[PDB]
C-alpha cells in the first residue's frame, strides 16, 4: 500500500493566520484530496483533485503539490476551522489517508469559571458519592485540578474530561469527578476543588461542607 | 502462530563495513515486520517498522528490506554505538512473536589484557572464606582461557567467570575470574597463580602471589 505521512501531527494558530498542512506520499501521485473532520462527526469533503472546493467549503481552502509533497493552505483561519484534516490518495489500491493534523485556534487567555457539585441524595442511596468540579469556557486547555478532602490531597480517585475546542469562542471546558463510597464520603466534612490556570493569578478553590444547603 | 527465524546467531564486523541480518517467517506476513536493537540492561528500541519504514531518530544508515516471508536488516557505515543484539518481530496479527536474536561484536584490533591478581582480604578471611580474584582488563577478542594453579596444581570446578559488555567507546571486553576456596584450604598453600591464555599474546601469561601479605 501507500503511506500518507502527514505533517505536523497538530498545530495552533491565531484567527487570521495563514495555515499550511503538509502531506507526503510514498509514491508519486498527481493530486490529493483533503477532508475536514469536526469532532463527533464524519469526515467531510474539503478539497477534491485538482483543487476544487467541496459543498459549503469557503474559498479560504486550497490544495497544492506535485511529486510526493502536497499542501493544504488555509489562507485566513477562522474559529470554526478547528478540526482534524486528512489528506487522501486515490490513484492506487487501496485508497489511503494520512493519520491526521489537528488544528487548534489560538485566542486571548480566558479564565475558567469554577463550579462544584455535591453528590445528589438520590445517588447516596445507591451507596456511592460522586463530587463533580466544573471549569467553564477557558483558554488555553492547560489546567490543573486538585482535590482536597479535609485538607488532604487526593490521588487515584478522580477523573477528568475535556471538551473539544468550541467553534464560536474557541474555548475548552473541564470536568473532574471525585468518586468515593457513601461510607468513606460520610467520614469527611469539607470537599475542596483547587483550580490552577494561566489566566488565574491565584488558584481558585470551590468548597462545601457535607450537607450545607 | 507465526515463527520468526533469524540468521545468523551472532556475527562480527569492523567499523565502516556493511552488515546484513536476515529474518524469515513461518507464514506470509506481507509488510508487517519490525526491527529492534537492544543493549541489555536497557529496553529494546525500534529501528524499522512496516518492513521498510524507519522510526524517529534512527540513523539513515539503517535500512529494512523484504516482504512476505523473507526480510532483511542492513547497517551501512558501522559505528561503536551499533553494538548489541538485534531482534525481528512481526506486527501482523495477535499473537506477535519475536526472533531468537543476533549478537553484534565489533572488531578492534587484537588487544592485550591488563592482568591483575587479588588475594583474599584479611576481613573476608576473618569471616571464614577465601575468594581469589583475577582481573583481565580491556582486550579483544572475547574468547579467553583462564586457568587457576595452586602450587602448580590445576583448579577444577571452583572458578567462576564474568564477562563485561563490549565498550561503546573503545569496543573492548573485560573478564573477572574468582577461585573460591575456604579459609582452611587457603592457609596450607603458598603460590596462587592465574594463567591467562589469549590470542593477542605469544606465551600464555601468568600472574601470581605468595600467600598472605607477602
Amino acid at each position: 500500500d501507500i503511506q500518507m505521512t502527514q505533517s505536523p501531527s497538530s498545530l495552533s494558530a491565531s484567527v487570521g493566520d495563514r495555515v499550511t498542512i503538509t502531506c507526503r506520499a510514498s509514491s508519486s501521485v498527481s493530486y490529493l484530496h483533503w477532508y475536514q473532520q469536526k469532532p463527533g462527526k464524519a469526515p467531510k469533503p474539503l478539497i477534491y483533485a485538482p483543487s476544487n472546493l467541496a459543498s459549503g467549503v469557503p474559498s479560504r481552502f486550497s490544495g497544492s503539490g506535485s511529486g510526493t509533497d502536497f499542501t493544504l493552505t488555509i489562507s485566513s483561519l477562522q474559529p470554526e476551522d478547528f478540526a482534524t484534516y486528512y489528506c487522501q490518495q486515490w490513484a492506487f489500491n487501496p485508497p489511503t489517508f494520512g493519520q491526521g493534523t489537528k488544528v487548534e485556534i489560538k485566542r486571548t487567555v480566558a479564565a475558567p469559571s469554577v463550579f462544584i457539585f455535591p453528590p445528589s441524595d438520590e445517588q447516596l442511596k445507591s451507596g456511592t458519592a460522586s463530587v463533580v468540579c466544573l471549569l467553564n469556557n477557558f483558554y488555553p486547555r492547560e489546567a490543573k485540578v486538585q482535590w482536597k478532602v479535609d485538607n488532604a490531597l487526593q490521588s487515584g480517585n478522580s477523573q477528568e474530561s475535556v471538551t473539544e475546542q468550541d467553534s464560536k469562542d474557541s474555548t475548552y471546558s473541564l470536568s473532574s469527578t471525585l468518586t468515593l463510597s457513601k461510607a468513606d464520603y460520610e467520614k469527611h466534612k469539607v470537599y475542596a476543588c483547587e483550580v490552577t490556570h494561566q489566566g488565574l493569578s491565584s488558584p481558585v478553590t470551590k468548597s462545601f461542607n457535607r450537607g450545607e444547603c | 502462530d507465526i515463527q520468526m527465524t533469524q540468521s545468523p546467531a551472532s556475527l562480527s564486523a569492523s567499523v565502516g563495513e556493511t552488515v546484513t541480518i536476515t529474518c524469515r517467517a513461518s507464514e506470509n506476513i506481507y509488510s508487517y515486520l519490525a526491527w529492534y536493537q537492544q543493549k541489555q540492561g536497557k529496553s529494546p528500541q525500534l529501528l524499522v517498522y512496516n518492513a521498510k519504514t524507519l522510526a524517529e531518530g534512527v540513523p539513515s544508515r539503517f535500512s529494512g528490506s523484504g516482504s512476505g516471508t523473507q526480510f532483511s536488516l542492513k547497517i551501512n557505515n558501522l559505528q561503536p554505538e551499533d553494538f548489541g543484539s538485534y531482534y525481528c518481530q512481526h506486527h501482523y496479527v495477535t499473537p506477535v512473536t519475536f526472533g531468537a536474536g543476533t549478537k553484534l561484536d565489533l572488531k578492534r584490533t587484537v588487544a592485550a589484557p591488563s592482568v591483575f591478581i587479588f588475594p583474599p582480604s584479611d576481613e573476608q578471611l576473618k569471616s571464614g572464606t577465601a575468594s581469589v580474584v583475577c582481573l583481565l582488563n580491556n582486550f579483544y577478542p572475547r574468547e579467553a582461557k583462564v586457568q587457576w594453579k595452586v602450587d602448580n596444581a590445576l583448579q577444577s570446578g571452583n572458578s567462576q567467570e564474568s564477562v563485561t559488555e563490549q565498550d561503546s567507546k573503545d569496543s573492548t571486553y573485560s573478564l573477572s575470574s574468582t577461585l573460591t576456596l575456604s579459609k582452611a584450604d587457603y592457609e596450607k598453600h603458598k603460590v596462587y597463580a592465574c594463567e591467562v591464555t589469549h590470542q593477542g599474546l605469544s606465551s600464555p601469561v601468568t600472574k601470581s602471589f605468595n600467600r598472605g601479605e607477602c
Binding site: 489517508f97 457539585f117 445528589s120 463533580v132 477528568e160 444547603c213 | -
Partner: protein
Amino acid sequence: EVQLVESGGGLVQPGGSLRLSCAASGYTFTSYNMHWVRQAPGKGLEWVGAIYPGNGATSYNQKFKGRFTISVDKSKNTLYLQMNSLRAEDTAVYYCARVVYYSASYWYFDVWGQGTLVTVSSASTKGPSVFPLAPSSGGTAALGCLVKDYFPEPVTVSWNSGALTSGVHTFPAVLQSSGLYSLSSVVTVPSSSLGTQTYICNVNHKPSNTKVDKKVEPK
C-alpha cells in the same frame, strides 16, 4: 437531499460476528459505488472495501479479504458490512461513504454517513445511572446531569428535548476503573430563571434501550 443512515453497531465479544447496514436515500442507489471506511477512536481512517450496487461487483482491502464481506439489497437501497471473527483491535466507528467519479479516474468520497460504533469487548451491556447536578447559590448558575456507569458507548444527552442548546457542554465519556463508561452534561443558565423555568436532561443509551428523563432541581 442525499442521506446515508447507518445501523447495527454495538457490543460484540471477541470471536463474534456483526452486520452493519447503510441506508441510502435521495439519489439513484445503483448509480454510485458505496464504500466502508472505519476509524478507531483517536486514530486515522482505514478503508475496508466497496461495492457497485448496480451489479454487486465488490472490492476489498487485502487486510480484510476473508473476515469482512460487503453486500447489497437493491430493492431496499441498503448496503451491508459483514464482520466475522472480530478481534479487540476492531473496535471503531464504521462509516459508509458514497463515491462519485467526476472525470475519468477522478473520484472522491462525496457523502458520508453518521457512522456506528462497533465495540469489541468481553464485558456485558450495562444501562446508565442518571443523577442530577443541582444548581445552588455571577449573573448565571450551573446545573447538569451525571451519566454514570454504562457500557458500551455511546450515550446521547439533550436538554429539554432539543429546546435548550446554547451554553451546553456534554463531556467525552471516560472509561472508569470499574470498566464502565461515565460522563456529564452541563448547562449554564440565568440565575433568575431558577425556580420558574424547568430543566430536564434526556439520556438515551440505545445499546441497552434505556430512556431516562431527569428533572434537575435546586435544594
